[PDB]
Amino acid sequence: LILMNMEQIERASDKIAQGVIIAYRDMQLERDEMYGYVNIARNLDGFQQINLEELMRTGDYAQITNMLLNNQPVALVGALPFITDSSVISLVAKLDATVFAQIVKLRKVDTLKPILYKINSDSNDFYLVANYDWVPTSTTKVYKQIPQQFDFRASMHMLTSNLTFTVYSDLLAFVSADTVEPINAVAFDNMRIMNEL
Amino acid sequence: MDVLYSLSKTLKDARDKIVEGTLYSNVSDLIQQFNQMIITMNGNEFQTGGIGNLPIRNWNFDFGLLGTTLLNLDANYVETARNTIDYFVDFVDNVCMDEMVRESQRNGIAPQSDSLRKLSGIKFKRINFDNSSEYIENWNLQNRRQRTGFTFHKPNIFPYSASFTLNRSQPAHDNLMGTMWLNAGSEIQVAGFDYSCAINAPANIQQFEHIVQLRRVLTTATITLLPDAERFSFPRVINSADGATTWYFNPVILRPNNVEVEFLLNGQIINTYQARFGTIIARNFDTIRLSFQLMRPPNMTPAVAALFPNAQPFEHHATVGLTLRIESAVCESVLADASKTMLANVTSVRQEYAIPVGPVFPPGMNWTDLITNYSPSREDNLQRVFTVASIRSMLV
Amino acid sequence: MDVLYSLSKTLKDARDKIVEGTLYSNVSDLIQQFNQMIITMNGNEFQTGGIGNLPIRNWNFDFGLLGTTLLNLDANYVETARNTIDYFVDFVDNVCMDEMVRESQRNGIAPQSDSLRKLSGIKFKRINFDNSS
Amino acid sequence: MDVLYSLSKTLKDARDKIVEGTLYSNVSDLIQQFNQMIITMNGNEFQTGGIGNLPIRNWNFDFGLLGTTLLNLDANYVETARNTIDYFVDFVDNVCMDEMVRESQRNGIAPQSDSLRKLSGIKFKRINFDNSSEYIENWNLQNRRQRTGFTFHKPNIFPYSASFTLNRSQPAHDNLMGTMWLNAGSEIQVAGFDYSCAINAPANIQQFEHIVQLRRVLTTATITLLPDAERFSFPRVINSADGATTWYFNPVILRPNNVEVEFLLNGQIINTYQARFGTIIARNFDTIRLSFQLMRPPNMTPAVAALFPNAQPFEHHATVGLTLRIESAVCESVLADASKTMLANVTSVRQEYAIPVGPVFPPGMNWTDLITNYSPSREDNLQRVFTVASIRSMLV
Amino acid sequence: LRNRWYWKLKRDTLPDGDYDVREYFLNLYDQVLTEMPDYLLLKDMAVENKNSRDAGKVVDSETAAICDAIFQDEETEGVVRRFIAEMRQRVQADRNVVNYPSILHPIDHAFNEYFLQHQLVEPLNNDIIFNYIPERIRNDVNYILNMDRNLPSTARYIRPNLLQDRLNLHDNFESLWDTITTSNYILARSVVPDLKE
Ligand SMILES: [Cl-]
Ligand SMILES: [Cl-]
Ligand SMILES: [Zn+2]
Ligand SMILES: [Zn+2]
Ligand SMILES: [Zn+2]
């Protein structure tokens, strides 16, 4: 049960994403009911995948460093903490593209914190989106899943059990156990254990 | 009857409405009625009898009530309900078969099988709910002595009869005047034949009268009337009234004259149709009187004039016809008809279990014998078995 | 071929074993294999070909897993399983038909249809299990 | 049926798997299924009935569960399992025999014996598990109105028939033209014979046509077609159709000309084979139309020209044969075939216990009579008894 | 202007890094195993449904809170509201069975359904207690065994797992086997009777 539901449980967490795609092309921000505009990736189709756990374990940063230096599109896969940035100015500053160079500097991946933009009317600078003609884009996307909606029909169950019972542990406490007088105790052969009397 | 019908109707509603994925609110009232049925039937033993080859069957009812737990019904719920429904349908079908094969001379309207007599007990009256079918509604209205009627498409109201009356006859059967007729089901095909073509009639007119007394009163009847009788318009070799010899019939069809259809009730002229053909309406009648005249054509072409000489021998016998078809009517008593299966159902059950001939019905439930001698006791027994058969048809 | 056979064998076992009233222990390994098949197939598009009069068909997999926590399978369980089984059976039959009507001279033993070539990818090797026929 | 099959399958698995020394992990699921069967059956009384000479038997189930606390099965465990297994195998054999000898016109698909009807109750559905046999698979599919399929090696689809048709004949029976055939099992041998060798036929061609209508649709059928019919290629003295006199046949075999085998479904040509003999495939058909021509050979050596004069007497009769053998096919209905034993088992059980003839099957379960008149009710009863026979043959 | 209902982790404590996520789920497995119930009696968790028009009860109080929140929500379908108001538990005391409505996430439902369907309590009667006594003591005439207690049909017990050694510590574990025989020897010393006269 745990193994089959692991992926669903992990993807429900609000503090880890499942990866980050660095695509040095300008990709439109998705329109998601949970965010407004969000640089969210539904899947990793179309990108080479670097497993972050394997990279941490090997210590060999040659391929990742070469790809980052040469701006080769890639998808870093692994449980990652992410920053939720609600500032349109941050997106225009393209700050989501500024977070990977520390990987090469330190040869670590445990401080990689990609930027997940969350642009909507609650952003202080949302008017820039509203009052100008332009498509909000970013060069990175965060591989994360969307929460499952509550559905009453799929959530209502009938649970059945017994009305009541009593569990017992000491079974031998239900047994009345006497012995014969030891003078009359017999062995397997039905004669008295001690017969010299 | 009302309890048996209510059981059948509850089961039919359960089978049609307790379906996978249906809203709980589609079935709330049905679930209540079904649980009331289960509670009433629980702890009751029934025996469906061993008349004929119908096997003796024992029925025990210990069933759990249906729950009310899902917004949309699921397969588990339908499965439990279907198990209960199947057992109940088996029981109801057996009770219906058991009742359909019994009869009584005195109280033929009352239940006859042990199970239906038990279901008439006060304890089972709680099962009763909507009695909406034509037959159960007629049954309830008849128990209260209220006027009600069964609607029949092509009622089998005429006992089968294919015979003739000769008004002028000779040993050689060559100058014959009379009538042939087939009365079958909802059809009356009558014909009047004159071998001389009314050569010597007072005004060259021969009058033919056919009177058919209906065994029950019919109301609101739509009837088709057609001038000719196709069944008596071709040459025939017909047995004599005793069958000693056979005579010859060589019809030539002439237009019926002074056609008069009278529909009579209690001897009063309820409806009269003179020379009217096609669709006619007979309000309410128990007798049909068809009076038609063969009129020798005053002017004839030479071929026609040659068909009918002035004296014997006669070779081309002048025939006038009439065809009456009751297409649909209303009768206060149950009757066989072309659309319903009640008679066929009762007869099939009686034949398939070798039910011995009883003291009410003719052997084999023959409809001609039944309708010919349609006594009040036969009417009561037939209404009972037809209501039971219609209750059975809702499930089987 | 081994993967296509594994899909078919899984579906045949599910038809034969996922039946009302049966103990879950009778089917537990089969349910694990079936859920593995669903997981491996989910999110993949397939096209069975238009060769001859065989119509072009598109196949999508977004199925949920079958339950594992009942003592005995019930009617709801069987209906839920049957819904997924029917689609998988249709897909496997179409892949088999698409592969049966194709031939190659250079490499006739290798798969010919696009679906069977896609199913030979390593990403589908998880489906593979008992090859007993 | 699925519960009876599940009992039999559990018993077969226990016989095969519960062996001395085996790892308990080899049997854990089987042990759980077996204990579930014991719990479900415990406390239930069954009567396998006394139809015919089959003895009445009473079955009582009070059995202990099989242990679950071993690492390897030992002799004690195997003996404890085997006593219970023996009793259960006896019970299943008697239930299967009770069901095989029974039939009904109404619900021949439904159970007939009391024990199987009892086992259809919901309180036994827990026993149900892997339904992997072809017969039980098709049983479940047909319960759901799904496309069924039975694979048959040499299906017994043709009722035995050794007949002839004479399209040219006379009292002397010496200038005859016609066809003779044996349709038996999966084989059709047909042979068209012309005594005049088509001397006077238009174009010196005599066309012969043989249409065989299969009582069920066959699909995916592999068929061997052979030019000659060895059954009608030797001299015979054949009775006349009325049986009054015997005529003489002295064939000399010519190769058939323009052989056309059509496989037709509802009268539409599904497959057509012209002048092809080796091995053909009829994908879906219920009719086989064999057209074949005797062509008088235009050029002859003197001996051949001697065989076939210009006029009578004709002593060497030109016969063109054809053999059609269905080696393997698929049918949506159960059928006897050369490899299975369902028909033989059902017939053997009915014979051994002197089961009186019933309303559905012909006496002795004669296959020719059965398949000639393969009615839907016959199909239901046959599928039921054949599935029960396969269940029995799993254990006996 | 409206919020939407979504399923969220009650405790969102997932770490970063795939290996640490798998460690988290191993710890979750251990938590479930340690807190796995041996039996359940739903009536103990049965609380009142505030909107019930038929004296309805639900399990558990979390279901009550969720159902009330759904009942009050303006965006709820009228059919769902009526069903919340009508949904009924079924207590069959004659059969010793209870059924309650519950609102659960499918994963939570799977866990609770497994717990309900795989309880470790078996029916306890006098025959089981009598057979629990070692057979050679039931057959020794020096001991008189009686069953002076009536067990109700609601009595339950949990069977001990007396499987024989799957590790074979008597084979090639000299130190462990020495300790096992020493401890057994100490116990046997405690139970041997003292000599008299
Ligand atoms: Cl009509
Ligand atoms: Cl062979
Ligand atoms: Zn009509
Ligand atoms: Zn006369
Ligand atoms: Zn002849």
Q: What is the DSSP string of chain C?
A: -HHHHHHHHHHHHHHHH--TT-BHHHHHHHHHHHHHHHHHHTT-EEEE--STTPPPEEEE--PPPPP---SB--HHHHHHHHHHHHHHHHHHHHHHHHHHT---SS-SSS--SHHHHHHTSGGGGGG------
Residue D284 annotated as binding site: no
**Residue of E18, E62, E133 for testing the chain A interface, max A β-carbons within 10 Å:** E18
Distances in Å between the Cα of B48 and the Cα atoms of B54, C16, E10 are 9, 40, 61
Q: Which residue has the tokens 């009595």?
A: E155
Q: Which residue has the tokens 């068809």?
A: B290
Q: Which residue from A minimizes the CA distance to C35?
A: A4
Question: Chain C contact for B20, CB < 8 A?
Answer: yes
Buried b (16+ CB within 10 A) or exposed e, E139-151: ebeeeeeeeeeeb
* CB-CB contact of A161 with E116 (8 Å): yes
Dmax (CA) for chain B in angstroms is 94
Report which DSSP code applies to D102.
-
Minimum-distance CB partner of C71 among E110, E111, E117: E117
Question: Chain C contact for D28, CB < 8 A?
Answer: yes
Determine the 3-state secondary structure of A93 from DSSP: coil
| Cα-Cα end-to-end distance for chain C | 12
Report which DSSP code applies to D299.
S
* CB-CB contact of B161 with B257 (8 Å): no
Which candidate, C40, C41, C30, C127, places its Cα nearest to that of C73?
A: C30
* Cα atoms in the 13 Å half-sphere on the side-chain side of A186: 8
What gap in Å lies between CA B244 and CA B238, rounded to an integer? Answer: 11
Determine the residue type at B3. V
How many CB pairs (< 8 A) connect D and E?
A: 6
Which candidate, D152, D162, D153, places its Cα nearest to that of D184?
A: D162
Angle, CA of D315, D318 and D324, to the nearest 5°: 140
- Region of D263 please: left (phi>0), alpha (psi -120 to 50) or beta: beta
Q: Which residue from C minimizes the CA distance to E110?
A: C69
Contact across the interface for A158 and B71, Cβ inside 8 Å:
no
Minimum-distance CB partner of C43 among A1, A4, A43: A43
- Give all strands (DSSP E) within D266-316, no chain letters: 268-274, 279-295
What gap in Å lies between CA C90 and CA C59, rounded to an integer? Answer: 9
Q: CA torsion angle for E114, E118, E120, E121 (degrees, to 10)? A: 110
Tokens of B158: 């005429």
What gap in Å lies between CA C124 and CA C37, rounded to an integer? Answer: 9
Contact across the interface for D32 and C23, Cβ inside 8 Å:
yes
Report which DSSP code applies to D15.
H
What gap in Å lies between CA C74 and CA B79, rounded to an integer? Answer: 10
Tokens of B72: 């949309």
Distances in Å between the Cα of D66 and the Cα atoms of B15, B284, D72, E99, E182 are 42, 81, 14, 32, 35
What gap in Å lies between CA D142 and CA B162, rounded to an integer? Answer: 51
Which candidate, D375, D254, D240, D262, places its Cα nearest to that of D319?
A: D254
Which candidate, B149, B148, B137, B142, places its Cα nearest to that of B328?
A: B149
Residues 35-94 of D with CB under 8 A from C: 36
Contacting chains of D (3 CB pairs or more, <8 Å) are B, C, E
Contacts of C68 in chain A (CB under 8 A): 1, 4
Which candidate, E124, E126, E37, E100, places its Cα nearest to that of A163?
A: E100
Angle, CA of E50, E51 and E53, to the nearest 5°: 115
* CB-CB contact of B246 with B259 (8 Å): no
Q: CA torsion angle for C45, C50, C55, C61 (degrees, to 10)? A: -10
Per the DSSP assignment, residues forming a β-bridge with B202 are none
Which candidate, B235, B261, B269, B251, places its Cα nearest to that of B322?
A: B261
Dihedral sign for Cα B299, B305, B307, B308, please: positive
B247 alpha carbon, closest ligand: 4
Return the H-helix or E-strand segment holding A21.
strand A17-28
What gap in Å lies between CA D130 and CA C27, rounded to an integer? Answer: 8
Question: Chain A contact for C51, CB < 8 A?
Answer: no
**For the sheet containing E121-123, what is the strand order?**
A166-168, E155-158, E121-123
Tokens of A78: 């692994």
D246 alpha carbon, closest ligand: 5
Buried b (16+ CB within 10 A) or exposed e, D359-390: ebbeeebebeebbeebeebbbbbbbbbbbbbb
Which candidate, B376, B220, B226, places its Cα nearest to that of B285?
A: B220
Which candidate, D112, D94, D101, places its Cα nearest to that of D361?
A: D101
Give D173 Cα–ligand 5 centroid separation in angstroms: 6
Q: Which residue from D minimizes the CA distance to C12?
A: D132
Which candidate, B390, B353, B396, B331, places its Cα nearest to that of B102?
A: B353
What gap in Å lies between CA B167 and CA E135, rounded to an integer? Answer: 110
Residue D286 annotated as binding site: yes
Angle, CA of A60, A64 and A65, to the nearest 5°: 90
Buried b (16+ CB within 10 A) or exposed e, B122-137: eebeebbbeeebebbe
Per the DSSP assignment, residues forming a β-bridge with A40 are A142
Contact across the interface for B24 and E86, Cβ inside 8 Å:
yes
* CB-CB contact of A154 with C76 (8 Å): no
Determine the 3-state secondary structure of A80 from DSSP: strand
Contacts of E157 in chain A (CB under 8 A): 167-169, 171
Omega before E60 within 30 of 0, i.e. cis: yes
Q: Which residues contact E126 (CB under 8 A, 6 or more apart)?
A: A174, E147, E149, E151
* Angle in degrees, 0-180, between the axes of helices B75-100 and C75-100, rounded to the nearest 10: 100
Q: Which residues contact E178 (CB under 8 A, 6 or more apart)?
A: none
Determine the 3-state secondary structure of D208 from DSSP: strand
Distances in Å between the Cα of C131 and the Cα atoms of C2, C35, D55, E143 are 7, 18, 46, 60
Q: Which residues contact E156 (CB under 8 A, 6 or more apart)?
A: A165, A166, A167, A168, E39, E121, E122, E123, E124
What gap in Å lies between CA D56 and CA D114, rounded to an integer? Answer: 12
Contact across the interface for C68 and A43, Cβ inside 8 Å:
no
Burial of D209 (0-12, 13-18, 19+ CB in 10 A): middle
What gap in Å lies between CA B130 and CA D154, rounded to an integer? Answer: 59
* CB-CB contact of D377 with D360 (8 Å): yes
One-letter-per-residue 3-state SS of chain B? CHHHHHHHHHHHHHHHHCCCCCEHHHHHHHHHHHHHHHHHHCCCEEEECCCCCCCCEEEECCCCCCCCCCCECCHHHHHHHHHHHHHHHHHHHHHHHHHHCCCCCCCCCCCCCHHHHHHCCHHHHHHCCCCCCHHHHHHHHHHCCCCCCEEEECECCEEEEEEEEEEECCCCCCCCEEEEEEEEECEEEEEEEECCCCCCCCCCEEEEEEEEEEEEEEEEEEEEEECCCHHHCCCEEEECCCCCCEEEECEEECCCEEEEEEEEECCEEEEEEECCCEEEEEEEEEEEEEEEEEECCCCCCHHHHHHCCCCCCCCCEEEEEEEEEEEEEEECCCCCECCCCHHHHHHHHHHHCCCCCCCCCCHHHCHHHHHHCCCHHHHHHHHHHHHHHHHHHCCC
Per the DSSP assignment, residues forming a β-bridge with D253 are D319
Contacts of E96 in chain A (CB under 8 A): 162-165
φ, ψ at D66 (rounded to 5°) = -75, 140
| Cα-Cα end-to-end distance for chain B | 17
Angle, CA of D58, D60 and D62, to the nearest 5°: 170
Model resolution, angstroms: 2.4
Q: Which residue has the tokens 């496997």?
A: C92
CA of residue B70 relative to chain centroid, distance: 47
Tokens of B383: 């209404």
What gap in Å lies between CA D11 and CA D84, rounded to an integer? Answer: 10
Helices (H), chain A: 2-12, 52-58, 62-69, 88-92, 101-106, 127-130, 152-155
Question: Chain B contact for E8, CB < 8 A?
Answer: no
Return the H-helix or E-strand segment holding D247.
strand D246-249
Q: How many CB atoms lie within 10 A of CB C38?
A: 19
Tokens of D190: 């047909």
Burial of B189 (0-12, 13-18, 19+ CB in 10 A): buried
* CB-CB contact of B214 with B275 (8 Å): no
Give D156 Cα–ligand 2 centroid separation in angstroms: 12
What gap in Å lies between CA D163 and CA D278, rounded to an integer? Answer: 26
Determine the residue type at E158. I
What gap in Å lies between CA E80 and CA E142, rounded to an integer? Answer: 70
Contact across the interface for D129 and C72, Cβ inside 8 Å:
no
* CB-CB contact of B344 with B70 (8 Å): no
Distances in Å between the Cα of E149 and the Cα atoms of A167, A178, D72, E146, E154 are 15, 15, 37, 9, 14
What gap in Å lies between CA D320 and CA E48, rounded to an integer? Answer: 91
What gap in Å lies between CA E87 and CA B21, rounded to an integer? Answer: 16
Q: Are strands A166-168 and A36-38 parallel, antiparallel or unpaired?
A: unpaired
How close D328 comes to chain B (CA, Å)? 40
Q: How many CB atoms lie within 10 A of CB A130?
A: 9
Which candidate, A123, A150, A142, places its Cα nearest to that of A14?
A: A142
Experimentally, the structure was elucidated by cryo-EM
Angle, CA of B115, B118 and B122, to the nearest 5°: 150
- Entry field: residues in chain D: 396
Q: Which residues contact E76 (CB under 8 A, 6 or more apart)?
A: A152, E70
Per the DSSP assignment, residues forming a β-bridge with B189 are B182, B323
- Entry field: residues in chain C: 133
Which candidate, D366, D392, D393, places its Cα nearest to that of D378?
A: D366
What gap in Å lies between CA C31 and CA C24, rounded to an integer? Answer: 9
φ, ψ at B18 (rounded to 5°) = -85, 85
Tokens of E154: 């609601």
Determine the 3-state secondary structure of D375 from DSSP: coil
Q: Which residues contact B345 (CB under 8 A, 6 or more apart)?
A: B100, B389, B392, B393
What gap in Å lies between CA B117 and CA B109, rounded to an integer? Answer: 12
What gap in Å lies between CA D295 and CA D192, rounded to an integer? Answer: 11
